[PDB]
């Protein structure tokens, strides 16, 4: 049985760079996938998209659109201390949080900073 860690590493292996917004999306997909016992179908959709010739980035976006736990789901809230706990390559993707953010519209997660600041990660 594929674990959350295994799937994260499988997906990371297809991505360029490090700590990018797509890396965080992998984290969110794996976390929510584990919590809903859906790692197997997520892995299968990921591999099927690649086998079709989609880029790995496209494959990850297609997951948020084709795997039902992500359809019209809100991004998860992640509590962090400061903006510096967010990876460097994610910094320019951080945005003010919109009224009703959705994962399948590109809102990966929402960071809640300890001082009350909030930032959404947008792809």
Ligand X SMILES: Cc1cc(C)c([C@H]2C(C(=O)c3cccs3)=C(O)C(=O)N2c2ccc(CC(=O)O)cc2)cc1C
Decide whether 4 or 15 has the Cβ nearer to ligand X: 4
Residue 95 binding ligand X, by CB under 6 A: no
50 binds ligand X per the rule CB under 6 A: no
Which residues contact residue 72 at a Cβ distance below 8 angstroms, ignoring those fewer than 6 apart? 102, 104
Coil vs helix vs strand at 95: strand
Residue 30 lies near ligand X (rule: CB under 6 A)? yes
Does 89 engage in binding with ligand X (CB under 6 A)?
no
Cβ pair 76, 110 in contact under 8 A: yes
DSSP tag of 110: E
Which residues contact ligand X (rule: CB under 6 A)? 4-5, 24, 27-28, 30-31, 34, 76, 78, 80, 85-86
């Amino acid at each position: 049985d594929i674990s959350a860690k295994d799937l994260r590493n499988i997906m990371y292996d297809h991505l360029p760079g490090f700590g990018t917004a797509f890396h965080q999306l992998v984290q969110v997909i794996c976390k929510l996938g584990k919590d809903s016992n859906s790692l197997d179908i997520i892995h299968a959709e990921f591999q099927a998209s690649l086998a079709e010739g989609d880029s790995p980035q496209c494959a990850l976006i297609q997951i948020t659109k084709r795997v039902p736990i992500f359809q019209d789901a809100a991004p998860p809230v992640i509590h962090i201390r400061s903006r510096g706990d967010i990876p460097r390559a994610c910094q320019k993707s951080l945005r003010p949080v919109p009224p009703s953010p959705k994962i399948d519209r590109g809102w990966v997660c929402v960071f809640q900073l300890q001082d009350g600041k909030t930032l959404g990660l947008k792809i």
